[PDB]
Design a protein around this ligand. Structure first.
Ligand SMILES: *C[C@@]1(O)C[C@@H](C(=O)O)C[C@@H](O)[C@@H]1O
Ligand SMILES: *C[C@@]1(O)C[C@@H](C(=O)O)C[C@@H](O)[C@@H]1O
Lengths: 252, 252
């Protein structure tokens, strides 16, 4: 394991790190959420750009990123446009996705970016290189909102992300059975124990999958998402309750 | 599913039931522990009879059971002599083990007894029948303190307990790896999905297995052990922390 350290937070050792997502339409809503989040306890702030209205303007997007950065100057900040292709709130062209991510990277405003593996090989490789050249980490991600692939398929995907230079491979899948939750845990453990040389994040979604959000220290997921007031994906629980469980498991 | 209702507690529905073990070496210590346990919060009290150092006397054993019952008149009370063969504190003859269990049964002081599956089929059947004749439920049990059998063999054993008339089959196994914990969860789920005729209790022991003590609601373990002050098996955590996690998982 080589860890990923952002603003004194060490991802990939100790207790899994808590990520929460900020979701807002516009500058005023982003400010209101950032302010409300001061009362919560978490490790990493993800800005879910796909919840923002004016994603067409690179200037509008960067202004919002700047507001968030300045609101929370000492928090690791992760920039994520979750495409509708992968379960997000709106569509984007591959070219405009590239433009927004490059602009986020070279602005200095973010510590980490999410890059969807399935975007396309040339765009992924170029964006990984661009991120690294500007001292930004890449969470390379994949999501299946309908079903859970085989463990073999999931492990190969996480390995592919590593081979493409992801700092943190990430996969989220939807269980259709309790068995599918075990498949996700099995894949996570296999990856972490046998192939990974860096942190990985995994989750099985929905209430059925929630154990996967709690047991990362055991099965090898380095971070986990909680909800401040609204979940950013199915299965997230109240962030304080998430923290309570993580602490109990860490100290067991 | 044939649930087991004891003093208004429905075992096999809702949150896994919290069991704690009372371990006292003599009558005075049993009394002191029973009194102290009243303020802890749990669902079922197990008396670990093999920790009692006056098991030579049937009178002494029954007097200790009566002290516990008098301290906790409304708590489901489980009488367990854990044999040295299966990880307990002392060795007694098979006839001594059976006599203590029969005396516990016919005293009316306890609601449930633990009977080890591999005591011998004829003796197990006879003692189950005697329990049922006196309105006592049987937790039939098996323990592997060395390692984790195959999922398939664990399921076979739980099904054998069902065939012998157990009210609640129970198996505890020792992980040698994180993978082994998943094996135990897999066996548990296979009972829930395919062999769900009565409640089952399962656990993977030690620190690596702790998640199995927390995730019973997900995969189908009907009860889970916590520690009041000292653990009665490896991997048990503080009972209030156990309860906190069970509640979070139940309400997720
Ligand atoms: C990584 C990610 O897709 C995981 C979601 C989850 O399942 O918790 C939350 C999203 O906000 C996040 O981008
Ligand atoms: C059933 C049993 O053997 C399970 C142990 C455990 O692993 O928590 C605790 C024992 O006291 C109990 O009899």
């Amino acid at each position: 394991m080589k860890t990923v350290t952002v603003k004194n937070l060490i991802i990939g050792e100790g207790m899994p790190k808590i990520i929460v997502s900020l979701m807002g339409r516009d500058i005023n809503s982003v400010k209101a959420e950032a302010l409300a989040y001061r009362e919560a306890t978490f490790d990493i702030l993800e800005w879910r750009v796909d919840h923002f209205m004016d994603i067409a303007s690179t200037q509008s997007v960067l202004t919002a990123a700047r507001v968030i950065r300045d609101a929370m100057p000492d928090i690791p900040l992760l920039f994520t446009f979750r495409s509708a292709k992968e379960g997000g709130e709106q569509t984007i062209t591959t070219q405009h996705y590239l433009t927004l991510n490059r602009a986020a990277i070279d602005s200095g405003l973010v510590d980490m970016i999410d890059l969807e593996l399935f975007t396309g090989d040339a765009d992924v490789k170029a964006t990984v290189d661009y991120a690294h050249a500007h001292n930004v980490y890449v969470v390379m991600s994949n999501h299946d909102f309908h079903q859970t692939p085989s463990a073999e398929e999931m492990v190969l995907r996480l390995r592919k992300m590593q081979a493409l230079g992801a700092d943190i491979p990430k996969i989220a899948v939807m269980p259709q059975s309790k068995h599918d939750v075990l498949t996700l845990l099995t894949a996570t453990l296999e990856m972490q124990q046998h192939y990974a040389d860096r942190p990985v994040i995994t989750m099985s979604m929905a209430k059925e999958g929630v154990i996967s959000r709690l047991a990362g220290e055991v099965f090898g997921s380095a971070a986990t998402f909680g909800a401040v007031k609204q979940a950013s994906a199915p299965g997230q629980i109240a962030v304080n309750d998430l923290r309570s469980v993580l602490m109990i498991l860490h100290n067991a």
